[PDB]
């Protein structure tokens, strides 16, 4: 990626990787929503919005003349297409089973490209140590399963399973993941609200993303108020945390998690 000050990130996974290594993205795709879903690692205003991650402004990119472009494999524009604009590397979110393991490999791979190996090791130690330190904040609330969700629309909820970013974190804290059903490669799946009523005694967190109008509509339905875990006083609305990120998204989760049930 030769010039570190001229790198364009076309997805929020690799943005997080750059950020953790100290790089300021020359460009970033969809900075507006990044505010609503990722929120953490805020973006310095200098950053140039290159458009939607799905349909980036190819004209702009060409004028920009990036030194290198990073993206998330299997998502967004075709790698063949892109490489026609400037050099770049696609990064994997997961191997389909462990996203955090992959994140650590992606962070290292990123560093290597930029010769920021030291900065990578410092972050990783900071990271592993921080996860370990918070462990005792969840020793009291024993084996009660936890359910991670987020509302997509009044009729659908996303649940995060065993192969989601948060799973490894749960494993290290001993929090059983209430969702053992199916999940896409990214670790999640959309379900109908009713499907959630099946969860009697469990803790439920729902990441917000500037969708309060949507939440109210949901909390307005008799089904929701009828929800057992709701009536049990186990439902919580927590701050947005990106579900398809890396180490900064995991550390952001531990924060929200800590505040929510620590």
UniProtKB/Swiss-Prot annotation:
Belongs to the bacterial solute-binding protein 8 family. NCBIfam families: PRK10576.1. It is found in: Periplasm. One of its GO terms (cellular component) is ATP-binding cassette (ABC) transporter complex, substrate-binding subunit-containing. It comes from Escherichia coli (strain K12). This is Iron(3+)-hydroxamate-binding protein FhuD. The keyword Signal applies. The gene is fhuD. The lineage of its organism: Bacteria, Pseudomonadati, Pseudomonadota, Gammaproteobacteria, Enterobacterales. The record marks 55, 57, 59, 156, 192, 195 as: Interaction with FhuB. Induction: Induced 1.3-fold by hydroxyurea. The complex is composed of two ATP-binding proteins (FhuC), a transmembrane protein (FhuB) and a solute-binding protein (FhuD). FhuD interacts with FhuB. Substrate-loaded FhuD binds FhuB more strongly than FhuD alone. One of its GO terms (biological process) is iron ion import across plasma membrane. Keywords: Ion transport, Iron, Iron transport, Periplasm, Signal, Transport. Changing residue 37 to L: Decreases binding of coprogen. Does not bind aerobactin and ferrichrome. Increases resistance to albomycin. Fe(III)-coprogen binds at residues 37, 53, 72, 75, 93, 186, 242-244. Residues 6-262 form the Fe/B12 periplasmic-binding domain. Its main location: periplasm. Exported by the Tat system. The position of the signal peptide cleavage has been experimentally proven. Can also be exported by the Sec system.
